[PDB]
């Protein structure tokens, strides 16, 4: 079975080097090329370089000074090193197998982030439902944490209908933030307790917040 | 470099439709063109190579056509697991270049956003900072414009949008815009308004509040 397994960390400090080992099985590196591609969010697939089957390498012009591509045949491994990363390098980094015509088998990817931020638990704030709202909306603001991810439930999984947990956003500070919102009927705000359950495993931070109407 | 151009970024389809994704190269690439599929989970798969040849494992509803500059990926009888982003790639001259990508999306009837504005919590204020959140809930299509007004003053690059993935039960989108000030700064304006422009509304909808109520 043809497979490509990427190892190496997602997180690189600014001005530090991104290292990704691409380990393979069920094909020979002597007989195939390994291509290195990245996908910035919203932008398209970007080719960075290749270890051809013969053992000679090639690079995209804009990365010539930043890239190293070596390989170890006996280990079934090709190695990728890019230097001096900045925020504009935030992407999924792919090793992919080249056959005659195309990139026919792909590594699972490596989600790469650039930050000098240290692990931080989030402050959770209530987004209290409007004094005159029919449907009402309420939520929790989950602010200033690193790294991703946080998970949010409502009343411990009991409330799932209308619940939208937004993709996190990276602030000027290097800290992530998101909102978890839920729509409920206006007539229940005096009648039912609504609690966001917030969990950030890397800071081992659990926190419940009751969202009290205004 | 050969420029590869998928002129539509977003493509609206319905399960059972014949969808055609289109790709134009900057010169003749003489049929040396591959199609890739990237899922939400980020796994990539080759679909077809040399214009029209199916890769092993790839279902038969996936076909290719084209010659010269212009090429097409066609998915007959479209299924839920085919909802992904699709990338063309020329194999004519180095370096390998890809198109910008075409993200599939579910067509449904127009739904206007329900708009809500949230002043900052008293507990955040006493923390020293002040976030103001504007929610656009369960709308279609995804195209929506959010303007922030502080005492009538149109705001630019002050705020950060976040958008949910198309919901898999009602096929809608929801959007969060977030405005951040110091406490002191927040403390010296009155009317924080959120103006929402969408295809589903006759005229733009404005949700606002005054600091204290």
């Amino acid at each position: 079975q043809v497979q490509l397994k990427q190892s190496g960390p997602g997180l690189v400090q600014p001005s530090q080097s991104l290292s990704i080992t691409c380990t393979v099985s069920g094909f020979s590196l002597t007989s195939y090329g390994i291509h290195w591609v990245r996908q910035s969010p919203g932008k398209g697939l970007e080719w960075l370089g290749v270890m051809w089957s013969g053992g000679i390498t090639d690079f995209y012009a804009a990365f010539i000074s930043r890239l190293s591509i070596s390989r170890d045949i006996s280990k079934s491994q090709v190695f990728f090193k890019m230097n001096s990363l900045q925020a504009d390098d935030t992407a999924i980094y792919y090793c992919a197998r080249g056959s005659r015509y195309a990139l026919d088998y792909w590594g699972q990817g490596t989600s790469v982030s650039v930050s000098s931020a240290s692990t931080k638990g989030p402050s959770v704030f209530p987004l209290a439902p409007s004094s005159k709202s029919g449907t009402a909306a309420l939520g929790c603001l989950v602010k200033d944490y690193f790294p991703e991810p946080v998970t949010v439930s409502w009343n411990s999984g009991a409330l799932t209908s209308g619940v939208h947990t937004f993709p996190a956003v990276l602030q000027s500070s290097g800290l992530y933030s998101l909102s978890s919102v839920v729509t409920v009927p206006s007539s229940s705000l005096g009648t039912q307790t609504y609690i966001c359950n917030v969990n950030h495993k890397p800071s081992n931070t659990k926190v419940d917040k009751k969202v009290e109407p205004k | 470099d050969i420029q590869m151009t998928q002129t539509t970024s977003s493509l609206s389809a319905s399960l059972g439709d014949r969808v055609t994704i289109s790709c134009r190269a900057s010169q003749d690439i003489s049929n040396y063109l591959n199609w890739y599929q990237q899922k939400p989970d980020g796994t990539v798969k080759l679909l077809i190579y040399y214009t029209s040849r199916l890769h092993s494992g790839v279902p038969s509803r996936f076909s290719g056509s084209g010659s010269g500059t212009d090429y097409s990926l066609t998915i007959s009888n479209l299924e839920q697991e085919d909802i992904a982003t699709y990338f063309c790639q020329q194999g004519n001259t180095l370096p390998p270049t890809f198109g910008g990508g075409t993200k599939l999306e579910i067509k449904r009837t127009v739904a206007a956003p329900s708009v809500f504005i949230f002043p900052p919590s008293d507990e955040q204020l006493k923390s020293g900072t002040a976030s103001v959140v504007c929610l656009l809930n369960n709308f279609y299509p995804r195209e929506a414009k959010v303007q922030w007004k502080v005492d009538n003053a149109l705001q630019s690059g002050n705020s950060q949008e976040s958008v949910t993935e198309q919901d898999s039960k009602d096929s809608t989108y929801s959007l969060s815009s977030t405005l951040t000030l110091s406490k002191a700064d927040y403390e010296k304006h009155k009317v924080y308004a959120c103006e929402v422009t969408h295809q589903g509304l006759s005229s733009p909808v404005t949700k606002s509040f005054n600091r204290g109520e």
Partner: peptide, 14 residues
């Protein structure tokens, strides 16, 4: 017609 083999890098024509 020009092409580049995605395995060896060998080119039939440039």
């Amino acid at each position: 017609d020009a092409c580049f083999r995605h395995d060896s890098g060998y080119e039939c024509h440039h």
